Amino acid sequence: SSAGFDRHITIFSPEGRLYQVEYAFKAINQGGLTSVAVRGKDCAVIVTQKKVPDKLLDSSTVTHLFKITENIGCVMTGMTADSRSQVQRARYEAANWKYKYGYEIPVDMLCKRIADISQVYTQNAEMRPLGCCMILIGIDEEQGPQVYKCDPAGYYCGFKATAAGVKQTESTSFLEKKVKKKFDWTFEQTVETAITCLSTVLSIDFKPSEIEVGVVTVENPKFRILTEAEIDAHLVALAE
Amino acid sequence: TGYDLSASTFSPDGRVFQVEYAMKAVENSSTAIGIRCKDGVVFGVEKLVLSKLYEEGSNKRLFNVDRHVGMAVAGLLADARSLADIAREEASNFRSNFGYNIPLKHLADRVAMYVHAYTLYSAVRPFGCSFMLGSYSVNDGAQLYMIDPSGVSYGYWGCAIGKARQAAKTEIEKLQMKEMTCRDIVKEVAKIIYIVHDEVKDKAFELELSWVGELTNGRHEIVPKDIREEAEKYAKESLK
Amino acid sequence: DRKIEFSLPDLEGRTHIFKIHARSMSVERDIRFELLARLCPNSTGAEIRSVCTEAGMFAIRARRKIATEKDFLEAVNKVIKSYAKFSATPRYMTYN
Amino acid sequence: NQYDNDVTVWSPQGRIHQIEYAMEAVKQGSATVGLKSKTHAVLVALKRAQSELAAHQKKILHVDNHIGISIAGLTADARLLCNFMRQECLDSRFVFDRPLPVSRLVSLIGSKTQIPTQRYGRRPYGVGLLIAGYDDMGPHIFQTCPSANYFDCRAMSIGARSQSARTYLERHMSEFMECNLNELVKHGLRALRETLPAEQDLTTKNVSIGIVGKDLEFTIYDDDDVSPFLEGLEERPQ
Amino acid sequence: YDRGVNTFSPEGRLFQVEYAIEAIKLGSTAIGIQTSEGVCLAVEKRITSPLMEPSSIEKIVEIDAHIGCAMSGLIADAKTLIDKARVETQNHWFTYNETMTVESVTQAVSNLALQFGEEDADPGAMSRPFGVALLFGGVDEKGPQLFHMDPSGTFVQCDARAIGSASEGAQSSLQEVYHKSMTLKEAIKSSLIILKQVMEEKLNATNIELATVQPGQNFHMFTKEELEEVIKDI
Amino acid sequence: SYDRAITVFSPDGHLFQVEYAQEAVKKGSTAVGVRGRDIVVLGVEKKSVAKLQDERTVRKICALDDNVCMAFAGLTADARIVINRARVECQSHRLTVEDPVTVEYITRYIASLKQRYTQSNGRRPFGISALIVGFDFDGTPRLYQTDPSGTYHAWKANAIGRGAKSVREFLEKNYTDEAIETDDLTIKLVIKALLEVVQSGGKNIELAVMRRDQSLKILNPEEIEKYVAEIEKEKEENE
Amino acid sequence: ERGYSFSLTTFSPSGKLVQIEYALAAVAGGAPSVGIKAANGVVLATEKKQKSILYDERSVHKVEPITKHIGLVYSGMGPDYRVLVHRARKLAQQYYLVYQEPIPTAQLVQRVASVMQEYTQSGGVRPFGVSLLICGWNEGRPYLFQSDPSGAYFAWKATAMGKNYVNGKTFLEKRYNEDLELEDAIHTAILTLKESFEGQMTEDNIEVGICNEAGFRRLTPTEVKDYLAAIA
Amino acid sequence: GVILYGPPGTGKTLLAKAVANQTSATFLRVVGSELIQKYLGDGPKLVRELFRVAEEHAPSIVFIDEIDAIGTKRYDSNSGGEREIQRTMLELLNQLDGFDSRGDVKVIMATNRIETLDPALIRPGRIDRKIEFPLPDEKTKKRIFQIHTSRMTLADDVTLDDLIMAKDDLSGADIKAICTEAGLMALRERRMKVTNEDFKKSKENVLYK
Amino acid sequence: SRRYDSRTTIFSPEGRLYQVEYAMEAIGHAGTCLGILANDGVLLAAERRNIHKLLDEVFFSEKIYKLNEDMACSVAGITSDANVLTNELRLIAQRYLLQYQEPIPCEQLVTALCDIKQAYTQFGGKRPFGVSLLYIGWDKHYGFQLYQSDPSGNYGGWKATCIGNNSAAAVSMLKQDYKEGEMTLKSALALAIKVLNKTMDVSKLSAEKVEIATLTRENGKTVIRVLKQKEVEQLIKKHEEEEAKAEREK
Numbered sequence A: 001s002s003a004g005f006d007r008h009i010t011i012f013s014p015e016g017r018l019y020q021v022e023y024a025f026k027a028i029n030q031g032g033l034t035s036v037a038v039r040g041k042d043c044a045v046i047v048t049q050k051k052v053p054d055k056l057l058d059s060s061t062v063t064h065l066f067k068i069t070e071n072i073g074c075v076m077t078g079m080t081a082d083s084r085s086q087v088q089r090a091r092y093e094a095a096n097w098k099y100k101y102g103y104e105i106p107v108d109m110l111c112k113r114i115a116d117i118s119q120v121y122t123q124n125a126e127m128r129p130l131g132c133c134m135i136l137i138g139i140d141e142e143q144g145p146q147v148y149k150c151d152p153a154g155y156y157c158g159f160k161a162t163a164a165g166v167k168q169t170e171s172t173s174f175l176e177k178k179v180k181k182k183f184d185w186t187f188e189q190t191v192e193t194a195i196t197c198l199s200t201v202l203s204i205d206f207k208p209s210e211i212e213v214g215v216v217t218v219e220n221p222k223f224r225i226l227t228e229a230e231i232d233a234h235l236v237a238l239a240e
Numbered sequence B: 001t002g003y004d005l006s007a008s009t010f011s012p013d014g015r016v017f018q019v020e021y022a023m024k025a026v027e028n029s030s031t032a033i034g035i036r037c038k039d040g041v042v043f044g045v046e047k048l049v050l051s052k053l054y055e056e057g058s059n060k061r062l063f064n065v066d067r068h069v070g071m072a073v074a075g076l077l078a079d080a081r082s083l084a085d086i087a088r089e090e091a092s093n094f095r096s097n098f099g100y101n102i103p104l105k106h107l108a109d110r111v112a113m114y115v116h117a118y119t120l121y122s123a124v125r126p127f128g129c130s131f132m133l134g135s136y137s138v139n140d141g142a143q144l145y146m147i148d149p150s151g152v153s154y155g156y157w158g159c160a161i162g163k164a165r166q167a168a169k170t171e172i173e174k175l176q177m178k179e180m181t182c183r184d185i186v187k188e189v190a191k192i193i194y195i196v197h198d199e200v201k202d203k204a205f206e207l208e209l210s211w212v213g214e215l216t217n218g219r220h221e222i223v224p225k226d227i228r229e230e231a232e233k234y235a236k237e238s239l240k
Numbered sequence C: 001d002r003k004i005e006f007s008l009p010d011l012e013g014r015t016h017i018f019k020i021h022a023r024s025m026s027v028e029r030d031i032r033f034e035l036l037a038r039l040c041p042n043s044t045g046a047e048i049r050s051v052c053t054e055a056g057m058f059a060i061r062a063r064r065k066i067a068t069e070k071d072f073l074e075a076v077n078k079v080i081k082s083y084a085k086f087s088a089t090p091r092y093m094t095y096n
Numbered sequence D: 001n002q003y004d005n006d007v008t009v010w011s012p013q014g015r016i017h018q019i020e021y022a023m024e025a026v027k028q029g030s031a032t033v034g035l036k037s038k039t040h041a042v043l044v045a046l047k048r049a050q051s052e053l054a055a056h057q058k059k060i061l062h063v064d065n066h067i068g069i070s071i072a073g074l075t076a077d078a079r080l081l082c083n084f085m086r087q088e089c090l091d092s093r094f095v096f097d098r099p100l101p102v103s104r105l106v107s108l109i110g111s112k113t114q115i116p117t118q119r120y121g122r123r124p125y126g127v128g129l130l131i132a133g134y135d136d137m138g139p140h141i142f143q144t145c146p147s148a149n150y151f152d153c154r155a156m157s158i159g160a161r162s163q164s165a166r167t168y169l170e171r172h173m174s175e176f177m178e179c180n181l182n183e184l185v186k187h188g189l190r191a192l193r194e195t196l197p198a199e200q201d202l203t204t205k206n207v208s209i210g211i212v213g214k215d216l217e218f219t220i221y222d223d224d225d226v227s228p229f230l231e232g233l234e235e236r237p238q
Numbered sequence E: 001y002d003r004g005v006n007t008f009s010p011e012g013r014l015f016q017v018e019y020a021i022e023a024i025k026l027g028s029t030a031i032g033i034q035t036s037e038g039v040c041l042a043v044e045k046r047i048t049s050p051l052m053e054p055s056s057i058e059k060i061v062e063i064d065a066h067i068g069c070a071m072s073g074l075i076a077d078a079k080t081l082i083d084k085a086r087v088e089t090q091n092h093w094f095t096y097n098e099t100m101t102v103e104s105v106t107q108a109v110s111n112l113a114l115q116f117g118e119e120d121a122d123p124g125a126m127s128r129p130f131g132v133a134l135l136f137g138g139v140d141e142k143g144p145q146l147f148h149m150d151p152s153g154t155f156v157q158c159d160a161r162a163i164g165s166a167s168e169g170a171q172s173s174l175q176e177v178y179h180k181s182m183t184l185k186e187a188i189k190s191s192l193i194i195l196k197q198v199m200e201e202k203l204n205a206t207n208i209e210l211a212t213v214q215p216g217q218n219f220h221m222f223t224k225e226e227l228e229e230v231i232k233d234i
Numbered sequence F: 001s002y003d004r005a006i007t008v009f010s011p012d013g014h015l016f017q018v019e020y021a022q023e024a025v026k027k028g029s030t031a032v033g034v035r036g037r038d039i040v041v042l043g044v045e046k047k048s049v050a051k052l053q054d055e056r057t058v059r060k061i062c063a064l065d066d067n068v069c070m071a072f073a074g075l076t077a078d079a080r081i082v083i084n085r086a087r088v089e090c091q092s093h094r095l096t097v098e099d100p101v102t103v104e105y106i107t108r109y110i111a112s113l114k115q116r117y118t119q120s121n122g123r124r125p126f127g128i129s130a131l132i133v134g135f136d137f138d139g140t141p142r143l144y145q146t147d148p149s150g151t152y153h154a155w156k157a158n159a160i161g162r163g164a165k166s167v168r169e170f171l172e173k174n175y176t177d178e179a180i181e182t183d184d185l186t187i188k189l190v191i192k193a194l195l196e197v198v199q200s201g202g203k204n205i206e207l208a209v210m211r212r213d214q215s216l217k218i219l220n221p222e223e224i225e226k227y228v229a230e231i232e233k234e235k236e237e238n239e
Numbered sequence G: 001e002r003g004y005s006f007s008l009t010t011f012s013p014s015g016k017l018v019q020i021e022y023a024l025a026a027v028a029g030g031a032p033s034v035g036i037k038a039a040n041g042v043v044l045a046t047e048k049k050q051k052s053i054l055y056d057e058r059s060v061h062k063v064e065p066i067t068k069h070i071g072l073v074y075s076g077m078g079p080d081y082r083v084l085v086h087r088a089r090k091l092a093q094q095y096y097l098v099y100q101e102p103i104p105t106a107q108l109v110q111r112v113a114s115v116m117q118e119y120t121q122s123g124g125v126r127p128f129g130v131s132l133l134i135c136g137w138n139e140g141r142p143y144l145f146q147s148d149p150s151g152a153y154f155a156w157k158a159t160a161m162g163k164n165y166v167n168g169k170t171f172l173e174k175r176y177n178e179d180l181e182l183e184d185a186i187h188t189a190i191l192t193l194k195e196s197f198e199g200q201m202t203e204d205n206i207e208v209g210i211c212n213e214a215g216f217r218r219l220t221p222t223e224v225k226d227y228l229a230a231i232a
Numbered sequence H: 001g002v003i004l005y006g007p008p009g010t011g012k013t014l015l016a017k018a019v020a021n022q023t024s025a026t027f028l029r030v031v032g033s034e035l036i037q038k039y040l041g042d043g044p045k046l047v048r049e050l051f052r053v054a055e056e057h058a059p060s061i062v063f064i065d066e067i068d069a070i071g072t073k074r075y076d077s078n079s080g081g082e083r084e085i086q087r088t089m090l091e092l093l094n095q096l097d098g099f100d101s102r103g104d105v106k107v108i109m110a111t112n113r114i115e116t117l118d119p120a121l122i123r124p125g126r127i128d129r130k131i132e133f134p135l136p137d138e139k140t141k142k143r144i145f146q147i148h149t150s151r152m153t154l155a156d157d158v159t160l161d162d163l164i165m166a167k168d169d170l171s172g173a174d175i176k177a178i179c180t181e182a183g184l185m186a187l188r189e190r191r192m193k194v195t196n197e198d199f200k201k202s203k204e205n206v207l208y209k
Numbered sequence I: 001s002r003r004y005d006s007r008t009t010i011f012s013p014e015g016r017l018y019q020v021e022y023a024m025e026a027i028g029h030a031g032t033c034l035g036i037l038a039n040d041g042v043l044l045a046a047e048r049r050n051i052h053k054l055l056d057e058v059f060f061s062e063k064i065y066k067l068n069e070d071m072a073c074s075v076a077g078i079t080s081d082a083n084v085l086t087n088e089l090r091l092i093a094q095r096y097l098l099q100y101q102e103p104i105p106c107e108q109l110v111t112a113l114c115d116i117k118q119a120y121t122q123f124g125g126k127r128p129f130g131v132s133l134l135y136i137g138w139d140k141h142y143g144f145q146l147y148q149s150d151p152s153g154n155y156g157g158w159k160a161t162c163i164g165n166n167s168a169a170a171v172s173m174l175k176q177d178y179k180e181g182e183m184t185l186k187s188a189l190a191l192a193i194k195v196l197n198k199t200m201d202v203s204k205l206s207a208e209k210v211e212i213a214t215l216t217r218e219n220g221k222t223v224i225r226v227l228k229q230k231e232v233e234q235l236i237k238k239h240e241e242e243e244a245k246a247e248r249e250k
């Protein structure tokens, strides 16, 4: 199935495939964490888990959520250093767009620019294609909430319910089963579904100190991170 | 085989092998610990004497990055000195550009990005030094950060690097460092380094201690000689 | 326990091998082998044995019963410098 | 063994091999010794020649009136580094108008030699510099290596068969703290004579000497004026 | 099975340089002797066919009015070194207005021997070190001086040198016929005797060439008129 | 900006790229050349006419300048660039020192270029061997031969290409003073040497002669027939 | 930094370029597509399929307008398509700046093919993995063209690409002619796309583009549903 | 030892046949394509048995043809991979120059791709003579045409000179092919003589496909 | 980095260099082209390959390209490199005209293109051009001319030549039947028709499967014509009837 240096760099194998890129997809799973994103009628929610195995480590600096812009938020999975570098590039690109065009940048253009930047690594034979994923949420005028996803191969898309990480398949299956019912979506319902998805996929029944939640809505488009108290409030309201 | 010769080849299971080899190069360094107090941090390094010819004070492993920032290194000395130089130049550049002393959350990030830039391409090799940055400011308290050669930096309440890192952190966790001022911490640091590295492994060694915090009004410097004398005099009592 | 190494003969080895391999033939009384040793810098004992046999064959070729120095010169100029596209020593001195 | 053909490749044990081979290369040169007293720094070198009809190779180089060096390895890289040292010291003398302290110079050499050990298709420098100097803090002895890792020492000896000299220097360390040049040089020569077979020792044609002091400029002695120093040595015990 | 141009050996050696060192055992032999009277240089030619023009090939070529050079090994690439030495001596004369010493020329030309490289440079010299061995003779302020250079870049002063394919035998014979109170005539006679003893073809007045330099006159090259006089009385 | 070593030293001390180039030369067409007191004659063989060629576009003898000519053996792709560079350099020498270029100067220039071209980065060595003939100023006819490693020489009579050893063996036993007494006798000597080589039956020879007076004089396939006939008749009469 | 500066595409002992063949093999596994022209305009039809209901089918598009009267569709790799689209847009812009006229179709095809060819000879790179279809309407006569990873191009009356392209070409052989209208062309395009389509064809799994002498545009899902009905 | 190399179809096996006819010793022939077996360790066994048979008879001649066929083509029927080829090679090298007393056996080898086989197999002391067979020259072309139509009832109209340069670089086998094909074509029409047009069509039939 | 290199410039032990050889083996397949001249006018004949039932047939030319007012050229091999080379020599001709204000002679243009083509076989480390092509033209220096190129770099003048897959048979038949200085632009067409009939396996010579281009001279025009499909058919049938008559004679 292989002949020559197709296993070591990015050139076509005889069947028409290339493996140096689909190796990154399984390099994603090295972190062992999962994140979920849900879009509602007028809001968008990002939820993830966090694990602190030792008491000596300072728990205030292990967040995977990042504020790309006052209106656009993101979550990362995979190797940490690559995710940090991609965050840096995204910040610079958004600021440059604001400088050049005089108005705020749409989320889809930002995702496209990032994917186009990432596509070069799988074209030349001297670089390594950065095994880290990408999820962005934002609010757009005349469109409402928007949730987009980007991958190391350069394939970006726009979803309604997404999961990234170890448990991607069954979480997507559960989300599909829930969304086929076609019920009305409000803020509390979206947050409850997002939390219960992870809760039933992992079967933990966790505490208000082991997850992180970010939310955006059309009342204050600023990206905000929920404080532990109100997270506990949703958690207890979920359990009747 | 051959998947572990370049730094641009993912192995079939999806991970990079050269960086792991750099890690294994680090694990043979001696030891270095650092813990933060109520109003500062304290570093501690045990330095082995290879032969009697060398002079005291040779090849210090406790570097002074900036006027209020200190560094402790472990690994290969040459790469450590290069990293110290690049961090020093970066800090001076920041002070010239903006106009005040750089915070840790920015300097540590910049050095981490520069280190991570050397793990993608096949024309350069990954670094081989793991190091710690410490500081104290009146408006921000005490700050401690640790950076590894793979390009990852975290914040800690107390950390150890070298051969017996886990053995040291075992007695590190027993301490209630959250409360006391770091005037009595020197004695316990001396005690915790004299309880490792059995005399069977090596004959003699020496202690190097740093100091920064509000006690010094922001300056970073070596401890006075008499204080270290008293500290080691106290630490010798573990023979009981 | 021991790792004896066999390397290509330097200069005395070449003259000594010539003397051993040519001491049982009908040759002229005043030939000097040191020059022949100087003419083949890096070579093995096998090529020297081949040199001797080929010089003898050149003498037999025409009619004579005793070889001369010209025969040895032609043998060296044919088995060392013309059969050089077919040697193993350039790639086995790196042991590959 | 494919982990042996470049300076970029990391071994499974985390040991690059090209640096180790350069450290192997530096051991092929002739032995040399260096040491310091309270107010002087003295280094001694043993020369070598191929045939009896050829002059002995020169080992001690003059860097500046307060800095001298001794080499071991291959001569081309040694000359390149010596030229760089000359240039840096002259530039410092020109700008700030003051001698360059030894420590800063050694740090500059260390930062310079580290660069080739990281790029692609670049080799390290094979040299064994021993640096002797005098400064505001007094005498100074330094040793470098091809791995861009300098050491600060009070007495050292490197080259081929340097171990016995190191043993002698180590067991006679304290006596260096009080004596003056007259017997300090004799101690250095006694150490150097230890690394030779039992046939030939010192005949004034194979030994060079270099001194720097508080009020004495860097001075080199070779083959004619060494006789005053060489006389007064007891015979090698049998 | 491929290694870079600069690569160290398990024992401390460089690969390209060792090969170049052993590749000069294919060239002609050449002998140089130094005496307080002057410096003598002699070399063979190794004519292959009767249709040669023996005057076309030459080994001894003068660098300046008082410095001569003899080359052995390959000959194609020694021209660059010779031209560099010429230009450098002329530049020193132009700037300082004097004649530069032999040792300075040798150490100035030896700096260029080991600059071959494959990465991070302009074309320069791609790989091969030079593959020539050079003998320098001259008369400077401290008398007559002879120097010998090596493809590794190491130069050293000698008193009697022989380089080429017949190096070791000529050196062994030369060690026992030399003293420090020679004259030029006996030096020339000894060099001729050695060359006759080791050379393959019969010696005559067209197979060899010789040069001598003295403090009095400048670099002088013998011709086919006075060359047979020193031969007939051998 | 392709920079990588092509020519390197073999462990026993040889540069295999240069030897491969020489062996590539050793399978070209044969070329021969001799000089007299006033006429210098050089010829080529193995024309192998396919009665469909335009002979003016395949000539292997080119005129560098008024008093110099050159014939090459090897692969023809690399010849014309060396031709062009030599023409430009020899014309450039005219704007400086006013005297015309001697044959020695241009031969040294070509040899130096060839040698330098085996030292740079990412360049394979040239693959041709050349004979340069000329009657320089003051009337001293001479010829030189250049090699792919960059070593030129001065000879009296040369043969390069396929089957050169036999031609050289024939020439070194036949080149005599009286054999060069007459112009037609020298041309007959060249024709005899070529005919004693690869078959080349009278219709596969192209010769050119300089008389140290004017430009090249390429001779049509008519005088060649007369010379061949006279040589054959003399050979028959001798037998 | 620096690249490699040596070609990764070389000649085999049998006189063939291997990498181009492997790129064509990768192209053959893409989504199917069809293209027809009949005397009045051109029709481009392509099939799209989201993996699950979670994907938003109105977020991205397959058919993309280079300018007011040029259309382009692809078959093969996904990410490589956008680079070519962007380059084509740039090239049209320089042409219009210089000549102050809309670019003719043939010139654009030639320039794009030149770029794609140049991308297989330079150093340290690998060729693109897509096959393109380009359509336009200039000076009355409609034009249709097809590119190739090797850089060559052809002019066609009817073309099928992607999976089972041989069956599509044979089917078009027995159906197409030289005198129809855009509506019948649409009908036969949907008919031939139904050969390898899914079980049920909805108004959102298919993208259709039409060019006439009024300009290029992409059909909205409503009329696509109208065309899907009353047929098959 | 003696080895013969050159381009294909130039007369190596023919010289071997002539030696076999003239000689008086027992003659053993084996092709290289059958030195590779389908199990493990069978190849060395076969080599050992071959030289044992050649040794135990008498003064003899061993002829091995197309050796390079073991290094060029690979077969899936081989149980091992490429290493058992190496084991067979090591066995052959031992048999040529082992430390046992060889006796009285002569070895002749022949191939047309000599730039691939192992240089340790051809060193002096194992193979001492190397003979190159070049392409035929036009004098030899005329001589070959004279040989191969010696007993053919050839008509007077034909001329060999025209056929000599029919192809620029034709080898020895093309001559025999052309002659035999012309003979067959004349045989079809129940004739005895051979005309020009027969040769003219025969060359097109044999050369231009 | 030196592990992944292919070394597309070095020599070989046997003297030759492989890449140009492999390119020449590649030019063996894929097409057939030939050229002939003996008097006023020179003709090129090409075998069309793309003969599928669905081709729009635009651009008025398949393989014949115009390079100047009086220069035309065919091509065989990979078509993309053909586009590159044709575009490359077009501006060479134009820049010569710009500098000298005189139509460029054919020989100089061919030599310039061959120099560019040879540049890739000595340094750079890139894959060579796998294209060989013909040239036909007229100039005041030597009247009418035909030339042939080569991926190796060399060239040469000719009187009648073929390049395609069956070039051997075409060359043999050409050298068997030709006359020097008599063939007008009436017999050359018949000769080319017969040669193509022999080389291609398909009989009856479908008129859509061949392409003919002729160059003739006028007072000041030097007209290049691509004769249409309305004149090939009677030429073919005339060849057929005369061949049948000649065979019936025997």
Ligand SMILES: Nc1ncnc2c1ncn2[C@@H]1O[C@H](COP(=O)(O)OP(=O)(O)OP(=O)(O)O)[C@@H](O)[C@H]1O
Pocket: H007, H008, H009, H010, H011, H012, H013, H014, H015, H112, H144, H171, H172, H173, H174, H176
């Ligand atoms: N020099 C020659 N003299 C006579 N006949 C010859 C000669 N060369 C070739 N032939 C003819 O060609 C035939 C081919 O011979 P043979 O197969 O032995 O050649 P080969 O070159 O050794 O073959 P291979 O390389 O394919 O093993 C011979 O049988 C003979 O008919």
Ligand SMILES: [Mg+2]
Pocket: H012, H013, H065
């Ligand atoms: Mg055979």
